[model samples]
Target chain A: DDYSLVHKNILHSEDLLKYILETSAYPREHEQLKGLREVTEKHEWSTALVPADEGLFLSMLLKLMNAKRTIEIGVYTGYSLLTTALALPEDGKITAIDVNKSYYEIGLPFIQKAGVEHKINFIESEALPVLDQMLEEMKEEDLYDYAFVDADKSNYANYHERLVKLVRIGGAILYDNTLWFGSVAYPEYPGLHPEEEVARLSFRNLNTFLAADPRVEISQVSIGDGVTICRRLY
Target chain B: DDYSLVHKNILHSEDLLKYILETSAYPREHEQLKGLREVTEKHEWSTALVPADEGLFLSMLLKLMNAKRTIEIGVYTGYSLLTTALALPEDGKITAIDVNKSYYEIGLPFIQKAGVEHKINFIESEALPVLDQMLEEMKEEDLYDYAFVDADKSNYANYHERLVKLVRIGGAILYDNTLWFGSVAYPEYPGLHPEEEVARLSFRNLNTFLAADPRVEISQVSIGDGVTICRRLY
Candidate 1:
């Protein structure tokens, strides 16, 4: 879990990131979000949690879109899920899926304490099957206003295929880690981790595919690990 | 003005920025936008124009918000203004202001060719005066759904004071260059350009003020010198 290698890949320097977090993100952080962040930091895969600034961005984006029905492909520690919950209206609904529920359980207390647990439907399973099932059984109301994917990199294209249909027209589907810790921009170098390289290649291919994809208009934001936002066009 | 020093301050490497531009932004860019970008690049202050990726981001954001009525504080070659116009509905309107009409005129042809010229109301004057007049002559319908500020850094606070009121509740006002080419995070260094230092300080203050201002929720995105998006609330 040497995640530190990937953490500093985006910005010019870590100090710049720290400056943004301290100046812009930390002060506005919800108490429960701060609580969840603190708890998640102790986990072995702490880097899996979305950074505070990205959570802030997502929260603002949800509120601006007035998103009511959303879905999340990964729920590690539920930080972003809680962020979405807090940003949504009282009656907002979110369907969150993850292969591992224990990571979500770690942050569930904070969600309950924040009084937003009722907004979430957490499914403990691999995302593709759940997404496929959702598409198959989908009703008009099941069309999501927003969808976030932060699960396996290898399945991103698959996720995009399903999400483009699952999300309503003009709705957004966000893919996290599309920059693959900035490795997508890196020239091939020896001694790179095999897993990291695979993730990098997967994201590079996905970025290329998403750029050319006609069903959605995309914006690749260089935030926490990089998030590519795709708004469904048809 | 030697803007290259400021340009390279954000990301870990220029290659990453180029990667984002070529992979995600360029392919999807509107033809007229590409034309404007190329035309503006020949200008002396070409760097003042919003980058392609940022233009794409702004376009997606406007579409996501379904913004119909918007205002822009700066019109350097009208890159972002045209980006906004293209993203908006056919009947959408934008009031754009800038001190130098000649600069805006340089890109006017592209705007005209894009057929979004009718959507823009270009005003030639300092932004503060235009904003003041706007606030004074304000009507219910005049309240913008979105506002974009890319003007003089010294008056950003003043602009914020007016914009928080001009943009509707739950609407967004994006302040560009808030990170001041990443100089805001840099510790004191001798021989740094005095103007950049001044801008750096101004944005530092603005970032602090916006973070504490409960009137809006803010996200300081690290894109094109850093754009701080403020969503107005009660």
Candidate 2:
């Protein structure tokens, strides 16, 4: 009886964690791939900016929706960016936005080594302004198959609005680290050691933002911390 | 480069843990519905059995496979069993085998409460004998739609032999805890932890067993220690 009790509790946390892992914008096997896994640890980014498990799920998600063109709001070491790159067709590409060139440059070799560099366009600039740039510049018909937001957490609600417009109807927009590694779980938005609170609360708000948005039908899988996915229905 | 070298080392362990946690073989909505999260904290024997994310994947797996008939080698308070059950259709059924009724009873009420009781038939007996009965009495013409082996680790090989015969071609078999909490990575076969040794051997056996048995498309998913999934090809 007691075992069952423990089973259920751990199962709950595991379920939440798993949910985030699946929805992560990375590929399934990328975690196993040595080159990419290196970046997360190097940065003391215990968890990748985007976990590989969920990163792998996107290919399937994209395949399910017949996606091709895509974009990424954040490109920390290009893990999630690589994920989108792999999901796209041979000619499909992701115009990635990031301000820290140092980190993106570090991951560039890995992505290039991974052989998806041809699929990623690294634009080193603060994401907030870039989101606006891409939206205004990209032609209406040159829509994206998928769009991902893993840039500044505080600006997530705004990023969501823009990505929806970029990802055509029937397309998907993936929001990552919405929970901020347990920081967002509490009213005070506690730190990571307490739990995945900051991440959880950020995710909660993001979830609310997405829910209120009328553009997409959502299926939020907890692949990495928490990935709130909205597949445009209209 | 230093960042990468550090990450490369940590990723191995983190990934193994993540892999183990993801395949819990427990679903999300089900956990929410059963309020199983509360129960998980209260129990001691739970053993963190299967990875929760993997559980959701398994649920999707059942739905995708349209699995109607299945069996579980270890019922251990029915967490995974409930997961499989909830995934089944209205007329679906799962033959559950466990040695202890008390623990199963603890989860049974919850299972019933979750309204998946009709889909489950629990066998309160040693697994080997029951497996023998199923092997002998049940037709050799691929009987089960899917099966999960999580009972006594010692007899894992025996379970596999029978499962190969019992599970129909194209059917699935998930062997849980194969990674044995990172124990399989160890080189020596120390008898200190029989379960560990068994888990290690099971991992090897699954690799060798599935390799020679060409009737399935098999690969191990890193979920809840390690879980190997096989979909019969023959």
Candidate lDDT scores, in order, read 0.89, 0.62
| TM values, all candidates | 0.97, 0.53
Could you say which candidate leads in TM-score? 1
Q: Indicate the DockQ of the complex predicted as candidate 2.
A: 0.04
Give the true-contact fraction for every prediction, in order.
Answer: 0.83, 0.00
Error of 1 at B78 (Å): 0.8
Q: lDDT (0-100) at residue B41 of candidate 1?
A: 91
Considering the two chains of model 2, state its CAPRI-style docking category: incorrect
Docking class of 1: high
The worst-scoring run of ten residues by lDDT in candidate 1 chain A lies at A1-10
Summarize candidate 1's per-residue lDDT along A161-215 as a digit string, tens digits: 8998899999999999888767788667444567667777888889999998889
Model 1 C-alpha RMSD to native: 1.4
Which window of 10 residues has the lowest lDDT sum in candidate 1 chain B? B1-10
Model 2 — TM-score against the truth?
0.53
DockQ of each: 0.85, 0.04
Residue range B1-234, candidate 2, lDDT tens digits: 211111221112343234223322122346542455457657775455444555655665565446789999887767778888887888998999989888787777778888889988888999888888887788755399889888887677778877877898767788776555544443564434445565566665555555456665444444445555766656
